[PDB]
Design a protein around this ligand. Structure first.
Ligand SMILES: c1ccc2[nH]c(-c3n[nH]c4ccccc34)nc2c1
Length: 265
C-alpha cells in the first residue's frame, strides 16, 4: 500500500570489512536505519542461512537479502553504539560494572547460539556491537558454522578466527569441541575489558606471555590490573585443556559473575 517505503538512502560507510563494505542506510519515508553489508560475490550462502536461523536480543538481527546479480546485500540491525572495541580505553579498559554487564549480555547471546547449535568462531570486541541503550549484540556470522544437528555434536577441524582470541586446542589438535573455543574467546574479551590490553599474541607454548599465565605469574600485566574476583573467573576460562575449561552454566554460578556492581540505566 505505501509507495516509496522501499527506498533507502545509503548515508555513510560504517566499516570497510575485508569482503567489502557496510553502509548505514536510512528509510526515506519512515527514517528507519539499517546497516547493509555489501558483498560482491565476485571478489555467503551459509552466512545468509545462519542469519535466518537467529532471533535473540543480543544477536544482530538480520532482516533480509537483496540479490542484485553479483552484489549481495545483507540487511542487518543498526547499532548506533558502534563496536565494543571503542569503549575499551587502551592500557586501562573500562569500569568493572560496565564490563560485567557487557559480559552478562555476551554470555546470554552465546548461550543462545550454542543452544541452537551454532558456533560463532570469531568472538572479539570488533564483532560486539552496541545499540542506543548500550545493549551488546554479537555480529558477523561470516566465520560461523553448525556444531549440533539433530542433537548430535560434530567436532570442528577448520582453523579460524583471530589469533589473540583463539583457544589453544585449535592450534594443537586436529579436532576439537566448538563450545569451549567460544568460551575461551569470551574470556579473552573479558581480559581486554578489564586491562585495556590483550595477554598474548597467540596461546602458544612458543609465546612467552602465555607461558607466564600457564606458570601463574599474575603479578605481571595484564593480570595485575585485574582484581581477584574477575581474575578468579578468568583462571577458570583460560584453562589450557578444553575438557577441563569452565562451561557456560558454570560461569553463571561464578562469584564475580553474580557480584552486585551496577545501578540500572
Ligand atoms: C558506529 C560505527 C560503526 C557501526 N557499525 C554498526 C553496525 N550496526 N550493525 C552492523 C552490522 C554489521 C556491521 C556493522 C554494523 N553500527 C555502527 C555504529
Amino acid at each position: 500500500a505505501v509507495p516509496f517505503v522501499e527506498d533507502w538512502d545509503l548515508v555513510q560507510t560504517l566499516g570497510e570489512g575485508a569482503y567489502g563494505e557496510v553502509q548505514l542506510a536510512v528509510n526515506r519515508v519512515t527514517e528507519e536505519a539499517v546497516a547493509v553489508k555489501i558483498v560482491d560475490m565476485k571478489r555467503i550462502k551459509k552466512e545468509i542461512c545462519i542469519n535466518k536461523m537467529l532471533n535473540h536480543e543480543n544477536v544482530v538481527k538480520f532482516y533480509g537479502h537483496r540479490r542484485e546479480g553479483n552484489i549481495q546485500y545483507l540487511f542487518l540491525e543498526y547499532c548506533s553504539g558502534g563496536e565494543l572495541f571503542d569503549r575499551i580505553e587502551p592500557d586501562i579498559g573500562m569500569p568493572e560494572p560496565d564490563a560485567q554487564r557487557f559480559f552478562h549480555q555476551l554470555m546470554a547471546g552465546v548461550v543462545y547460539l550454542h543452544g541452537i547449535g551454532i558456533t560463532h568462531r570469531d568472538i572479539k570486541p570488533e564483532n560486539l556491537l552496541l545499540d542506543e541503550r548500550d545493549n551488546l549484540k554479537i555480529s558477523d556470522f561470516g566465520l560461523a558454522t553448525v556444531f549440533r544437528y539433530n542433537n548430535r555434536e560434530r567436532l570442528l577441524n577448520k582453523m579460524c578466527g583471530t589469533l589473540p582470541y583463539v583457544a589453544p586446542e585449535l592450534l594443537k589438535r586436529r579436532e576439537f569441541h566448538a563450545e569451549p573455543v567460544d568460551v575461551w574467546s569470551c574470556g579473552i574479551v573479558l581480559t581486554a575489558m578489564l586491562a585495556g590490553e590483550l595477554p598474548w599474541d597467540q596461546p602458544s607454548d612458543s609465546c612467552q606471555e602465555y607461558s607466564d599465565w600457564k606458570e601463574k605469574k599474575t603479578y605481571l600485566n595484564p593480570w595485575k590490573k585485574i582484581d581477584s574476583a574477575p581474575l578468579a573467573l578468568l583462571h577458570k576460562i583460560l584453562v589450557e585443556n578444553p575438557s577441563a575449561r569452565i562451561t557456560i552454566p558454570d560461569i553463571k554460578k561464578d562469584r564475580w559473575y553474580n557480584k552486585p556492581l551496577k545501578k540500572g540505566a
